[PDB]
């Protein structure tokens with residue numbers, strides 16, 4: 408059994424194993440870091456089944472849960488938030504924060520999303536690139552999702568830049584373990600203080616809603632509120648940064664489609680849909696253990712055996728998406744959903760927010776900077792390490 412996670416075939420490409428497995432062995436066994444074996448599911452239809460089957464559990468203290476590293480194994484010891492819950496606990500806690508992320512609520516946020524993107528682009532213009540390329544990640548891709556989610560949680564404007572840097576340190580590939588865990592503690596300590604404050608005078612933010620509607624009535628206590636707030640910050644931020652940067656790089660690689668976006672900014676939604684299918688930047692989140700024996704394709708998965716469902720592979724499934732390895736913002740979409748945000752009850756709570764952010768970025772960026780160019784040869788883009796989710800570490804641009 409091959410070791411899993413697989414390595415990406417190159418900087419921007421999924422692992423090569425997935426296409427071979429989809430063709431010849433779509434439910435197969437892989438070997439995890441600790442020697443245990445898990446089942447790997449690669450076809451779109453089977454990923455949807457794993458994501459919705461009531462016979463499968465996300466509870467991480469069940470025998471067989473497929474942790475992919477040693478830190479995940481010890482993270483499993485902490486009190487769980489709704490990301491690691493089964494029904495009915497899952498929606499009980501998830502519904503406490505879902506009102507901010509509904510399509511209606513995200514529509515109302517759209518002026519603020521646009522103002523945030525406008526302000527950060529205007530700052531980048533004023534900085535200019537007269538002394539060399541600037542890093543689109545540090546200058547734009549990182550602060551846009553960071554400022555928005557921090558602001559929604561309730562962080563005041565003056566604290567945004569420090570906390571944005573600290574959260575970046577958490578996931579930066581060249582951080583030492585001491586740097587990353589110190590940045591992590593910095594974030595937890597700040598959120599605990601913000602929770603204490605909102606308990607005394609609530610404002611109009613997510614932490615205030617939790618303190619007022621759940622902590623004070625006793626449905627959760629203030630430490631749960633910290634954990635839930637922390638989850639909403641760290642679950643998707645690094646992914647948002649990577650999606651923005653991957654979108655720019657992808658458009659640099661497909662000049663004809665960038666030309667269409669420049670001439671019709673209203674194509675941004677379709678560009679975003681294809682971006683999230685093609686670059687599945689969160690590919691290791693759909694993991695389960697079997698509560699009972701369950702049949703998947705031609706394989707029997709026994710109780711207490713772990714399953715990993717690759718939405719990355721599913722988003723390249725030849726049986727669902729015609730020419731899946733071509734980036735084509737003008738593709739015709741089948742009835743099946745792309746799985747960039749997962750599927751079923753656990754499907755990304757922030758799907759609408761994430762897409763609204765991505766759509767605002769790509770309908771604005773080239774209107775502001777019509778000559779935005781990646782400043783290094785495209786073959787020299789600094790992608791994330793091949794053993795990690797696809798992403799871009801830094802992206803020098805001129806404009």
Ligand code: HEM
Pocket residue numbers: 458489490491501552556638639640642643644646647650688689690692693718746747748749750751752753754755756757758760761
């Ligand atoms: C483009 C950016 C994003 C992508 C591609 C993405 C992708 C995903 C994926 C694949 C999952 C697993 C869903 C499943 O189990 O079926 C997920 C879950 C989640 N995401 Fe996102 N996400 C993004 C942005 C965000 C943001 C901005 C936030 C927070 C504000 C967020 C919070 C979450 C949470 C809390 C979960 C767990 C939901 C649950 O188990 O009920 N994500 N996301």
